[PDB]
Design an enzyme around this catalytic site. Structure first.
Site, PDB file in Angstrom:
ATOM      1  N   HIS B  20       0.810  -1.227   0.000  1.00  0.00           N
ATOM      2  CA  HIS B  20       0.000   0.000   0.000  1.00  0.00           C
ATOM      3  C   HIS B  20       0.844   1.279   0.000  1.00  0.00           C
ATOM      4  O   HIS B  20       1.652   1.498   0.907  1.00  0.00           O
ATOM      5  CB  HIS B  20      -0.943   0.006   1.212  1.00  0.00           C
ATOM      6  CG  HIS B  20      -2.074   0.978   1.097  1.00  0.00           C
ATOM      7  ND1 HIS B  20      -3.297   0.637   0.561  1.00  0.00           N
ATOM      8  CD2 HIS B  20      -2.170   2.281   1.453  1.00  0.00           C
ATOM      9  CE1 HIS B  20      -4.097   1.688   0.591  1.00  0.00           C
ATOM     10  NE2 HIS B  20      -3.437   2.698   1.127  1.00  0.00           N
ATOM     11  N   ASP B  22       0.103   5.561  -0.990  1.00  0.00           N
ATOM     12  CA  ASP B  22      -0.915   6.573  -1.323  1.00  0.00           C
ATOM     13  C   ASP B  22      -0.358   7.774  -2.113  1.00  0.00           C
ATOM     14  O   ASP B  22      -0.853   8.897  -1.992  1.00  0.00           O
ATOM     15  CB  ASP B  22      -1.634   7.029  -0.038  1.00  0.00           C
ATOM     16  CG  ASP B  22      -2.738   6.082   0.377  1.00  0.00           C
ATOM     17  OD1 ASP B  22      -2.605   5.430   1.436  1.00  0.00           O
ATOM     18  OD2 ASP B  22      -3.742   5.983  -0.356  1.00  0.00           O
ATOM     19  N   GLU B 131      -9.116   1.613  -1.497  1.00  0.00           N
ATOM     20  CA  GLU B 131      -9.133   1.589  -0.034  1.00  0.00           C
ATOM     21  C   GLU B 131     -10.533   1.928   0.499  1.00  0.00           C
ATOM     22  O   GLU B 131     -10.781   3.044   0.953  1.00  0.00           O
ATOM     23  CB  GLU B 131      -8.049   2.523   0.529  1.00  0.00           C
ATOM     24  CG  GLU B 131      -7.648   2.205   1.965  1.00  0.00           C
ATOM     25  CD  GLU B 131      -6.521   3.080   2.494  1.00  0.00           C
ATOM     26  OE1 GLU B 131      -6.052   3.987   1.769  1.00  0.00           O
ATOM     27  OE2 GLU B 131      -6.091   2.857   3.647  1.00  0.00           O
ATOM     28  N   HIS B 158     -12.666   1.763   4.747  1.00  0.00           N
ATOM     29  CA  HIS B 158     -11.606   2.660   5.205  1.00  0.00           C
ATOM     30  C   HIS B 158     -11.931   3.012   6.670  1.00  0.00           C
ATOM     31  O   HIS B 158     -11.994   2.101   7.496  1.00  0.00           O
ATOM     32  CB  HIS B 158     -11.445   3.872   4.280  1.00  0.00           C
ATOM     33  CG  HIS B 158     -10.252   4.716   4.609  1.00  0.00           C
ATOM     34  ND1 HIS B 158     -10.353   6.034   5.001  1.00  0.00           N
ATOM     35  CD2 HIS B 158      -8.933   4.413   4.649  1.00  0.00           C
ATOM     36  CE1 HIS B 158      -9.147   6.511   5.248  1.00  0.00           C
ATOM     37  NE2 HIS B 158      -8.267   5.547   5.041  1.00  0.00           N
ATOM     38  N   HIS B 200      -7.939  -1.803   7.892  1.00  0.00           N
ATOM     39  CA  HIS B 200      -9.003  -0.838   8.242  1.00  0.00           C
ATOM     40  C   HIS B 200     -10.353  -1.439   8.694  1.00  0.00           C
ATOM     41  O   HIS B 200     -11.214  -0.692   9.164  1.00  0.00           O
ATOM     42  CB  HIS B 200      -9.232   0.190   7.116  1.00  0.00           C
ATOM     43  CG  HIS B 200      -8.106   1.157   6.937  1.00  0.00           C
ATOM     44  ND1 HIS B 200      -8.059   2.370   7.592  1.00  0.00           N
ATOM     45  CD2 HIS B 200      -6.994   1.102   6.167  1.00  0.00           C
ATOM     46  CE1 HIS B 200      -6.962   3.016   7.239  1.00  0.00           C
ATOM     47  NE2 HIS B 200      -6.299   2.269   6.375  1.00  0.00           N
ATOM     48  N   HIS B 221      -1.961  -3.112   4.640  1.00  0.00           N
ATOM     49  CA  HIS B 221      -1.138  -2.346   5.579  1.00  0.00           C
ATOM     50  C   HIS B 221      -1.704  -2.406   7.005  1.00  0.00           C
ATOM     51  O   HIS B 221      -2.495  -1.556   7.419  1.00  0.00           O
ATOM     52  CB  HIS B 221      -0.929  -0.898   5.093  1.00  0.00           C
ATOM     53  CG  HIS B 221      -2.193  -0.128   4.854  1.00  0.00           C
ATOM     54  ND1 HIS B 221      -3.154  -0.518   3.946  1.00  0.00           N
ATOM     55  CD2 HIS B 221      -2.635   1.036   5.390  1.00  0.00           C
ATOM     56  CE1 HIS B 221      -4.141   0.359   3.947  1.00  0.00           C
ATOM     57  NE2 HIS B 221      -3.850   1.313   4.813  1.00  0.00           N
ATOM     58  N   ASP B 291       2.386   1.745   3.697  1.00  0.00           N
ATOM     59  CA  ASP B 291       1.469   2.888   3.817  1.00  0.00           C
ATOM     60  C   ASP B 291       2.232   4.220   3.685  1.00  0.00           C
ATOM     61  O   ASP B 291       1.871   5.219   4.315  1.00  0.00           O
ATOM     62  CB  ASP B 291       0.660   2.823   5.132  1.00  0.00           C
ATOM     63  CG  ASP B 291      -0.569   3.732   5.131  1.00  0.00           C
ATOM     64  OD1 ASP B 291      -1.090   4.081   4.051  1.00  0.00           O
ATOM     65  OD2 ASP B 291      -1.021   4.100   6.233  1.00  0.00           O
TER      66      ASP B 291
HETATM   67 CO   LIG Z   1      -4.182   4.591   1.870  1.00  0.00          CO
HETATM   68 CO   LIG Z   2      -4.855   3.087   5.099  1.00  0.00          CO
END
Ligand SMILES: [Co+2]
Ligand SMILES: [Co+2]
Ligand SMILES: [Cl-]
Ligand SMILES: [Cl-]
Ligand SMILES: [Co+2]
Ligand SMILES: [Co+2]
Lengths: 381, 381
Positions: B20, B22, B131, B158, B200, B221, B291
């Site tokens: 993961h 972002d 996500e 999430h 999550h 993650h 992450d």
């Molecule tokens: Co993310």
């Molecule tokens: Co996350």
């Protein structure tokens, strides 16, 4: 009959590729996109002008399956627009599932090479087009993702004005042709290799799109104005600009577009419309765009998708040469798709910049300062 | 150093595939998905923990690029949900454009074979995951189209409860794990070949998903609960059920998930978390899920994507065998993706029925009677 034999031979030599069929929306109306255990009905439909048995019977070589959803009518304008985007993904989903569950009949195609390879295997080349720019919810990113999902043409409007262009059947005019966004979208559609479709758009929007476009466009389902005056039909002016554009007008079987009295419309009228365009702008710029399942009833002699051999025989009977009939059947729309993809390849090859969405600022200045301070701390290490 | 040489050799033998990152949402924050003429910045970013120069420097073999969009916070609940769907297509669009404009560094992958072929060419294997199931706007059709766009895992939530499952960080619980829709979606995700991601999600949602799933899942993650108690971390119970499931826990670099005091978190803690899981459920069920760019600051020793060779060397220094380090680096997540695709192929091969959307009736009985009457008229001919 020798002419029936000739028509059958032509249908096996080259694919008859129809410009527009709304059978996916009929599945949404009837089955509600649930085709599990509905094969008996999908082969022999209780309604409509298209099913998988009659599709084989008419010897159709290819089809642009419409992923149409209605123009948004919700009072909340943002919700209606965003709803159309979700509904578009549902219609693209059911089209892909229709093709994947029936691989012996249907095979997905998104190019000239994929159309041919599908046709050699004995499959109907299954392409996809969306009927209106209301379907993308004002998102050029979404439009590029629709292209990635297999959409190969976009009708600029349906029966509603949008941010990009004017529809034919709505008054008053909003933009008076294409908007400033619309003009910019023409460049982006040419760059990505999306075939422009000018059916349902206003006469002024056609004129502007035909002059501006760097790739050839289509009319996925429109007829001739001089033979039958209608907002949906193509004027002589736009027929000439289509010739310069190198595009193809795919003649519609809609009865209102062929004759003033709807019940008087026939197969002979469709051939008059094909011959008119073929005579004036050449047979390399004419096609077949039925709009089957976008109407309740078809013309006399073209009642459903099994009637394509009658059209091929009818064109040959009038004195249209085999080579010109093959062009009208499918070679012309293959050429346009081939040229659209070449124009995209050469524009992408020259590093032309893509049209970005208008995106809002998600971070304030406080967030950005924390991020820049944090980056410089890592640089110190 | 000989161990630095050993780590470099391992990084070239097998791809280190991170679970993961972002960086696509950082592009949305900073550039607003407009990367035209921003190559100098994309290679040397003024913010964040990821850029194309540091990505090369750390010798990363593959990456699941996150197509995250925020949980909807609009008062109008339907608009917020539909907005998330449009934003998802924008994030998938910018990820595909990021890969396509930098083909020498990034290469798109959606399978075990495509990961390897990307790695042999010297490219970072670029995979995609979303996500949260808030991103699909309650549409299973949309989810299948996201799979077609290249999405290969879906985080079930999430930081918000949705129709399908409960998030970890939100109280009270809505469903108390998976909903009835959620349970039905697990079957559909297994059928289509979408890798389930349990980061999550609530502890109860993990337990239920781990028992129900017919394919192995991941934690893209998440870290270990016994070492650091947090709602986001994986309990011993769920670690054992992950072992039975044949899944992989990809250890997170989030400082709050590694230690009680955030500023005390380190590379050594990440290795403690990897070794804990590897000791108790075997090294074939542990991975790396940084992450990066989902946090402002990383642990000491893992400040950005250039620091992966320090992690590989650190694992070898602790006495984790080369074969087990290769597993943790990427072979495990490759295996899960390979098994997810095999389970999908065997379920699709057995003709398992797909989960359809709940679609509204668009036609009334009057429309349907006209259509059936019209069809029977055509049958008479
Ligand atoms: Co993310
Ligand atoms: Co996350
Ligand atoms: Cl050929
Ligand atoms: Cl291999
Ligand atoms: Co239509
Ligand atoms: Co139409």
């Amino acid at each position: 009959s020798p002419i029936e034999e000739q028509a059958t031979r032509l249908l096996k030599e080259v694919p008859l590729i129809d410009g527009h069929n709304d059978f996916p929306y009929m599945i949404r109306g009837w089955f509600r996109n649930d085709i599990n255990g509905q094969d008996a009905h999908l082969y022999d439909m209780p309604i409509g002008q298209t099913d998988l048995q009659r599709l084989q019977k008419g010897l159709l070589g290819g089809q642009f399956w419409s992923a149409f959803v209605p123009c948004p009518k919700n009072p909340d304008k943002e919700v209606g627009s965003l709803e159309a985007l979700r509904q578009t993904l549902q219609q693209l989903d059911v089209i892909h599932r229709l093709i994947e569950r029936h691989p012996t009949i249907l095979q997905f195609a998104d190019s000239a090479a994929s159309i041919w390879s599908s046709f050699r295997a004995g499959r109907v080349a299954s392409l996809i087009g969306i009927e209106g720019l209301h379907q993308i919810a004002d998102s050029v990113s979404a439009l590029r993702m629709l292209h990635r999902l297999g959409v190969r043409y976009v009708t600029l409007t349906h029966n509603c004005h949008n941010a990009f262009a004017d529809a034919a059947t709505v008054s008053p005019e909003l933009h008076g042709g294409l908007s400033r966004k619309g003009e910019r979208l023409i460049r982006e559609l040419n760059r990505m290799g999306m075939m422009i479709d000018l059916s349902h758009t206003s006469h002024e929007a056609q004129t502007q799109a035909l002059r501006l476009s760097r790739a050839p466009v289509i009319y996925s389902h429109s007829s001739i104005y001089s033979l039958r005056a209608h907002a949906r039909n193509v004027t002589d002016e736009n027929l000439h600009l289509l010739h310069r554009n190198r595009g193809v007008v795919m003649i519609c079987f809609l009865r209102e577009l062929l004759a003033s009295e709807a019940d008087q419309a026939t197969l002979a009228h469709v051939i008059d419309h094909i011959i008119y365009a073929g005579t004036r702008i050449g047979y390399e710029h004419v096609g077949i765009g039925s709009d089957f399942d976008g109407m309740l009833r078809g013309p006399d002699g073209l009642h459903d998708v099994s009637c394509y051999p009658a059209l091929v025989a009818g064109l040959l009977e009038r004195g249209v040469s085999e080579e010109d009939v093959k062009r009208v059947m499918g070679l012309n729309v293959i050429r346009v798709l081939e040229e659209v993809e070449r124009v995209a390849a050469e524009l992408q090859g020259a590093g032309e910049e893509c049209l970005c969405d208008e995106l809002d600022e998600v971070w304030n200045e406080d967030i950005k300062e924390q991020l820049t301070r944090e980056r410089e701390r890592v640089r110190k290490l």
